[model samples]
Target: LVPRGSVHHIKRRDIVLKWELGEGAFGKVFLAECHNLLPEQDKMLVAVKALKEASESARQDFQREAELLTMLQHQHIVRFFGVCTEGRPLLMVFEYMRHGDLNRFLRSHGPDAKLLAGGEDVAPGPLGLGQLLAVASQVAAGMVYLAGLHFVHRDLATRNCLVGQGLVVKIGDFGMSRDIYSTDYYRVGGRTMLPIRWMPPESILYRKFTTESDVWSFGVVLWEIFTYGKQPWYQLSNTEAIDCITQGRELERPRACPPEVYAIMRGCWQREPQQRHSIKDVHARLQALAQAPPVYLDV
Candidate 1:
């Protein structure tokens, strides 16, 4: 159930589906054009998640996601324009992220060493440390906003974040979480799927999800950014990953990651949720890091 006046009711005829962007358990996402959706722009590109089936449960799930997006409003968070409930195949409209997910974007546009080694040219030049830090900071700032609203993202991996124009990143997802990125999630006891690598000890053990758990996930996201989207705990299975976290083994500092930034990552991995840095604190520290002058010499 969505709140009145919170979202717009879009007519199905007005939306022209261009091509499939992605597909998931619930439905497929499309790159689409909306006629007269915005006043300034006669038409604009948008990502539309269309329901695959008209099942009762599927409709409810789609509505739930639409309602959640309506409550969120921030530059770093994905924008929800409206929903199309006038026809069969319900549709949820959102801002089109040209670059798609953060993980793929980073992997294609990583540091010079990696980029040079690869044949594909995603960017004109390799992503610099400053640019990487800026991406991390923007995610932190977005998390700060979510924390302020007392909303637990429950999923904060780089794969769940989208990169728009000018390298601007935004936290986003639909019912597609379990569909396209199935490897990132592990099915617990053949039922509950969880992002074990990005999860903290408390969340892995007790199913306790809060802003603190989100903070922990944020740290992993930072690692993903610095490492240019390397999979966390890539060498381990779900059980092994759990053991590493419960045993207090944190991810090694990324090779190019600054000591100062690694320190922040370590703080987020603290076994006790109360001991972790607040999202606000993390954002502020990242801002300070960004403001500090770059070192010209090691001497």
Candidate 2:
């Protein structure tokens, strides 16, 4: 564990919980208000993540993420406000996401969601077609920018993405990111890879991560948005999904996704990482989706 500083007393609650976001394997999230922050930013909300003490491996991951977020500056990525390393109990403060996780948005769709996507298909999901294109373009643009800087984001799923005002997508979680073309990396077996479902065949069998591998993950994220954030399977358990993914399998595509987008997915999922589409390619294709019409799915 990082030697956290001494506990600071909070006469009033340090974190005022407004809503319960959800739970993760190692942590819980709360939509809360911070007592002390940017002096004039009282109106702003923050994403407060409360996780337990990490294992040695998890600590390394956290350190890597913290260090990278501190250094990388990109608009399409999450803004790292600051963290609390000192204090009795630990927590992190991040810019609040208004739309929450894309998963949440999709799950919120009632039993008639498919009916809705068909009946009143708009350009963007809640964000709109233009917004979706802009966000996807911006995210890929950000990745290309990062690749140019020689950084690798091993985990590039939608859950790690945050959408704020204007439907902007901000990529976070550098805990799994590493320097590209460099050997200084820390991995915890497949744990470094809770990312299997999105893995290209090369990544599944050979444990490799290149710019192409990152693009493959980006394709799965595109699925998340197009599906309004549904899990790859609303029916399958974690173990089942993991098993299917470990051997170059893919989940069924959501109903009514455009052929343009599905074709884009195929390019990203190419077995050969080198054969995978580039972020520029993914961005361009998604940008075009802005003009391609949406189709109604069978309910």
Which candidate number would show the highest lDDT if scored against the true structure?
A: 1
Clashing pairs in 2: 7-88, 123-128, 123-129, 124-128, 124-129
Error of 2 at 100 (Å): 1.5
Task: State residue 246's C-alpha deviation in candidate 1, in Å.
Answer: 0.7
Among all candidates shown, the one with the greatest TM-score: 1
What clash count goes with each model?
0, 5
Q: Each model's TM-score, in the order given?
A: 0.92, 0.69
Q: For each candidate in the order shown, give its overall lDDT on alpha carbons.
A: 0.84, 0.61
Error of 1 at 262 (Å): 0.5
Relative to the true structure, candidate 1 reaches a TM of 0.92
How would you encode candidate 2's per-residue C-alpha lDDT over 119-194 as one tens digit per residue? 2332222444454556566667778777878777877766666656655667764232232211222243654434
Lowest lDDT 10-mer window, candidate 1? 113-122
